CSV table of all heavy atoms in Angstrom, one decimal:
chain,number,residue,atom,x,y,z
A,256,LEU,N,118.3,101.8,97.4
A,256,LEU,CA,118.7,100.5,97.9
A,256,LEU,C,120.2,100.4,98.1
A,256,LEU,O,121.0,100.9,97.2
A,256,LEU,CB,118.3,99.4,96.8
A,256,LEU,CG,116.8,99.2,96.7
A,256,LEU,CD1,116.5,98.4,95.5
A,256,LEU,CD2,116.3,98.5,97.9
A,257,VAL,N,120.7,99.9,99.2
A,257,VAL,CA,122.1,99.7,99.5
A,257,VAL,C,122.3,98.2,99.7
A,257,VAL,O,121.5,97.5,100.4
A,257,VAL,CB,122.5,100.5,100.7
A,257,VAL,CG1,124.0,100.3,101.0
A,257,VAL,CG2,122.2,102.0,100.5
A,258,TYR,N,123.4,97.7,99.2
A,258,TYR,CA,123.8,96.3,99.3
A,258,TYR,C,125.2,96.1,99.9
A,258,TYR,O,126.0,97.0,99.8
A,258,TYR,CB,123.7,95.6,98.0
A,258,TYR,CG,122.4,95.5,97.3
A,258,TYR,CD1,122.0,96.6,96.5
A,258,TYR,CD2,121.6,94.4,97.5
A,258,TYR,CE1,120.7,96.5,95.9
A,258,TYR,CE2,120.3,94.4,96.8
A,258,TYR,CZ,119.9,95.4,96.0
A,258,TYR,OH,118.7,95.4,95.4
A,259,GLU,N,125.4,95.0,100.5
A,259,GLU,CA,126.8,94.6,101.0
A,259,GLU,C,127.2,93.3,100.3
A,259,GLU,O,126.4,92.5,100.0
A,259,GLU,CB,126.7,94.4,102.5
A,259,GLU,CG,126.5,95.6,103.3
A,259,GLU,CD,126.6,95.4,104.8
A,259,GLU,OE1,126.4,94.2,105.3
A,259,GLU,OE2,126.8,96.4,105.6
A,260,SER,N,128.5,93.2,100.0
A,260,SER,CA,129.1,92.0,99.4
A,260,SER,C,130.4,91.7,100.1
A,260,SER,O,131.3,92.5,100.1
A,260,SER,CB,129.2,92.0,97.9
A,260,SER,OG,129.9,90.9,97.5
A,261,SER,N,130.5,90.5,100.7
A,261,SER,CA,131.8,90.1,101.4
A,261,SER,C,132.7,89.3,100.5
A,261,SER,O,133.8,89.0,100.9
A,261,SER,CB,131.5,89.3,102.6
A,261,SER,OG,130.6,90.0,103.5
A,262,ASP,N,132.3,89.1,99.2
A,262,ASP,CA,133.1,88.2,98.4
A,262,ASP,C,133.3,88.9,97.0
A,262,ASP,O,133.1,88.2,96.0
A,262,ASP,CB,132.5,86.8,98.2
A,262,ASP,CG,131.0,86.9,97.9
A,262,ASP,OD1,130.4,88.0,97.6
A,262,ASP,OD2,130.3,85.9,98.0
A,263,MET,N,133.7,90.1,97.0
A,263,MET,CA,134.1,90.8,95.8
A,263,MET,C,132.9,90.8,94.8
A,263,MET,O,133.1,90.7,93.6
A,263,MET,CB,135.4,90.3,95.2
A,263,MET,CG,136.0,91.0,94.0
A,263,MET,SD,136.3,92.8,94.4
A,263,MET,CE,137.2,92.7,95.9
A,264,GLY,N,131.7,91.0,95.3
A,264,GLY,CA,130.5,91.0,94.4
A,264,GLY,C,129.8,89.7,94.0
A,264,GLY,O,128.8,89.8,93.3
A,265,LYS,N,130.4,88.6,94.4
A,265,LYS,CA,129.8,87.3,94.1
A,265,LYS,C,128.4,87.2,94.6
A,265,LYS,O,127.4,86.7,93.9
A,265,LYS,CB,130.6,86.1,94.5
A,265,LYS,CG,130.1,84.8,94.1
A,265,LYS,CD,130.9,83.6,94.7
A,265,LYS,CE,130.2,82.3,94.5
A,265,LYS,NZ,130.3,81.4,95.7
A,266,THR,N,128.2,87.5,95.9
A,266,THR,CA,126.9,87.5,96.5
A,266,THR,C,126.6,88.9,97.1
A,266,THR,O,127.5,89.5,97.7
A,266,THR,CB,126.7,86.4,97.6
A,266,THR,OG1,127.8,86.6,98.5
A,266,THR,CG2,127.0,85.1,97.0
A,267,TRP,N,125.3,89.3,96.9
A,267,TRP,CA,124.9,90.6,97.5
A,267,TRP,C,123.8,90.4,98.4
A,267,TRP,O,122.9,89.5,98.2
A,267,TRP,CB,124.4,91.5,96.4
A,267,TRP,CG,125.3,92.0,95.3
A,267,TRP,CD1,126.5,91.4,94.9
A,267,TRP,CD2,125.2,93.2,94.6
A,267,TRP,NE1,127.1,92.2,93.9
A,267,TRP,CE2,126.3,93.3,93.7
A,267,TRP,CE3,124.3,94.3,94.5
A,267,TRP,CZ2,126.5,94.4,92.8
A,267,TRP,CZ3,124.5,95.3,93.7
A,267,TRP,CH2,125.6,95.4,92.8
A,268,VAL,N,123.8,91.2,99.5
A,268,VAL,CA,122.6,91.1,100.5
A,268,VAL,C,122.2,92.6,100.7
A,268,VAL,O,123.1,93.5,100.8
A,268,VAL,CB,123.0,90.4,101.8
A,268,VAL,CG1,123.4,89.0,101.6
A,268,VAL,CG2,124.1,91.2,102.5
A,269,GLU,N,120.9,92.8,100.7
A,269,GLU,CA,120.5,94.2,100.9
A,269,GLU,C,120.9,94.6,102.3
A,269,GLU,O,120.7,93.8,103.3
A,269,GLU,CB,119.0,94.3,100.7
A,269,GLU,CG,118.5,95.8,100.8
A,269,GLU,CD,117.1,96.0,100.5
A,269,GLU,OE1,116.4,95.1,100.0
A,269,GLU,OE2,116.6,97.1,100.9
A,270,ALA,N,121.3,95.8,102.5
A,270,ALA,CA,121.8,96.3,103.8
A,270,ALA,C,120.6,96.8,104.7
A,270,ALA,O,120.5,97.9,105.1
A,270,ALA,CB,122.8,97.5,103.6
A,271,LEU,N,119.7,95.9,105.0
A,271,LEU,CA,118.5,96.2,105.7
A,271,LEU,C,118.8,96.6,107.1
A,271,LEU,O,118.0,97.4,107.7
A,271,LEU,CB,117.6,94.9,105.8
A,271,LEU,CG,117.0,94.5,104.4
A,271,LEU,CD1,116.2,93.2,104.6
A,271,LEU,CD2,116.2,95.6,103.8
A,272,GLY,N,119.8,96.2,107.7
A,272,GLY,CA,120.1,96.5,109.1
A,272,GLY,C,121.0,97.8,109.3
A,272,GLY,O,121.3,98.1,110.4
A,273,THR,N,121.3,98.5,108.2
A,273,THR,CA,122.1,99.7,108.3
A,273,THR,C,121.7,100.8,107.4
A,273,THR,O,121.2,101.9,107.9
A,273,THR,CB,123.6,99.4,108.0
A,273,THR,OG1,123.7,98.6,106.7
A,273,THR,CG2,124.2,98.4,109.0
A,274,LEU,N,122.0,100.7,106.1
A,274,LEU,CA,121.8,101.9,105.2
A,274,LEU,C,120.7,101.8,104.1
A,274,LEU,O,120.4,102.8,103.6
A,274,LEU,CB,123.1,102.2,104.6
A,274,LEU,CG,124.3,102.5,105.5
A,274,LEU,CD1,125.6,102.7,104.6
A,274,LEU,CD2,124.0,103.7,106.4
A,275,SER,N,120.2,100.6,103.8
A,275,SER,CA,119.3,100.5,102.8
A,275,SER,C,118.0,101.3,103.1
A,275,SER,O,117.4,101.2,104.2
A,275,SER,CB,119.0,99.1,102.3
A,275,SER,OG,118.4,99.1,101.0
A,276,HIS,N,117.4,102.0,102.1
A,276,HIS,CA,116.2,102.8,102.2
A,276,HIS,C,116.3,104.0,103.2
A,276,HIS,O,115.3,104.7,103.4
A,276,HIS,CB,115.0,101.9,102.5
A,276,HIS,CG,114.3,101.4,101.3
A,276,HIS,ND1,113.0,101.2,101.2
A,276,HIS,CD2,114.9,101.1,100.1
A,276,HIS,CE1,112.7,100.8,100.0
A,276,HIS,NE2,113.8,100.7,99.3
A,277,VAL,N,117.5,104.3,103.7
A,277,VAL,CA,117.7,105.5,104.5
A,277,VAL,C,117.5,106.7,103.7
A,277,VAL,O,116.7,107.6,104.0
A,277,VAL,CB,119.1,105.5,105.1
A,277,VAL,CG1,119.4,106.9,105.7
A,277,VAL,CG2,119.2,104.4,106.2
A,278,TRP,N,118.1,106.7,102.5
A,278,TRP,CA,118.1,107.9,101.7
A,278,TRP,C,117.1,107.8,100.5
A,278,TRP,O,116.8,106.7,100.1
A,278,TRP,CB,119.5,108.3,101.1
A,278,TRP,CG,120.4,108.7,102.2
A,278,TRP,CD1,120.4,109.9,102.9
A,278,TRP,CD2,121.5,108.0,102.8
A,278,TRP,NE1,121.5,110.0,103.8
A,278,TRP,CE2,122.1,108.8,103.7
A,278,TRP,CE3,122.1,106.7,102.5
A,278,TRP,CZ2,123.3,108.3,104.5
A,278,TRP,CZ3,123.2,106.3,103.2
A,278,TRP,CH2,123.8,107.1,104.2
A,279,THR,N,116.7,108.9,100.0
A,279,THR,CA,115.7,108.9,98.9
A,279,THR,C,115.8,110.1,97.9
A,279,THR,O,116.7,110.9,98.1
A,279,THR,CB,114.3,108.7,99.5
A,279,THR,OG1,113.4,108.4,98.4
A,279,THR,CG2,113.8,110.0,100.2
A,280,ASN,N,115.0,110.1,96.9
A,280,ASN,CA,115.1,111.1,95.9
A,280,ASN,C,114.4,112.4,96.1
A,280,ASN,O,114.6,113.4,95.3
A,280,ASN,CB,114.5,110.4,94.6
A,280,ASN,CG,113.1,109.8,94.8
A,280,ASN,OD1,113.0,108.6,94.8
A,280,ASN,ND2,112.1,110.6,94.9
A,281,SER,N,113.5,112.5,97.1
A,281,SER,CA,112.6,113.7,97.3
A,281,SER,C,111.8,113.4,98.5
A,281,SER,O,111.8,112.2,99.0
A,281,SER,CB,111.7,113.9,96.1
A,281,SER,OG,110.8,112.8,96.1
A,282,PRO,N,111.1,114.4,99.1
A,282,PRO,CA,110.2,114.2,100.3
A,282,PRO,C,109.2,113.0,100.0
A,282,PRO,O,108.9,112.3,101.0
A,282,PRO,CB,109.6,115.5,100.5
A,282,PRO,CG,110.5,116.5,99.9
A,282,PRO,CD,111.2,115.8,98.7
A,283,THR,N,108.7,112.9,98.8
A,283,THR,CA,107.7,111.9,98.6
A,283,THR,C,108.2,110.6,98.0
A,283,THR,O,107.4,109.6,97.8
A,283,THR,CB,106.6,112.4,97.7
A,283,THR,OG1,107.2,113.0,96.5
A,283,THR,CG2,105.8,113.6,98.3
A,284,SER,N,109.5,110.5,97.7
A,284,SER,CA,110.1,109.3,97.1
A,284,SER,C,109.7,108.9,95.7
A,284,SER,O,110.1,107.8,95.3
A,284,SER,CB,110.1,108.1,98.1
A,284,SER,OG,110.8,108.4,99.3
A,285,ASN,N,108.8,109.6,95.1
A,285,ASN,CA,108.3,109.2,93.8
A,285,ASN,C,108.9,110.1,92.6
A,285,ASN,O,108.2,110.1,91.6
A,285,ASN,CB,106.8,109.3,93.8
A,285,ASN,CG,106.3,110.7,93.8
A,285,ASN,OD1,107.0,111.6,94.2
A,285,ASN,ND2,105.1,110.9,93.3
A,286,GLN,N,110.0,110.7,92.9
A,286,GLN,CA,110.6,111.5,91.9
A,286,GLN,C,111.9,110.9,91.3
A,286,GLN,O,112.4,109.9,91.8
A,286,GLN,CB,111.0,112.9,92.5
A,286,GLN,CG,109.8,113.6,93.1
A,286,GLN,CD,108.9,114.2,92.1
A,286,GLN,OE1,109.3,114.9,91.2
A,286,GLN,NE2,107.6,113.9,92.2
A,287,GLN,N,112.4,111.6,90.2
A,287,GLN,CA,113.7,111.2,89.6
A,287,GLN,C,114.7,111.3,90.7
A,287,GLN,O,114.7,112.3,91.5
A,287,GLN,CB,114.0,112.2,88.5
A,287,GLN,CG,115.3,112.0,87.8
A,287,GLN,CD,115.4,113.0,86.6
A,287,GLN,OE1,114.4,113.7,86.2
A,287,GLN,NE2,116.6,113.1,86.0
C-alpha cells in the first residue's frame, strides 16, 4: 500500500491513481 499526504501526515489518501498496489512481496502476493 502506498499513501500520499499533503499536510505533513495529518491526512492520508491511498495512492490509487499512481503507485499503490503496484509492488508486492512475491509472484503470488501471499508471502512475507
Side-chain angles (χ1 to χ4, degrees):
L256 292 167
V257 183
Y258 297 86
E259 294 184 336
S260 172
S261 300
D262 48 13
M263 190 55 53
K265 184 186 168 221
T266 54
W267 292 28
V268 297
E269 185 176 347
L271 294 177
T273 49
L274 301 179
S275 198
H276 274 212
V277 165
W278 294 287
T279 188
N280 51 254
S281 64
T283 51
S284 296
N285 71 336
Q286 304 285 308
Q287 177 176 350

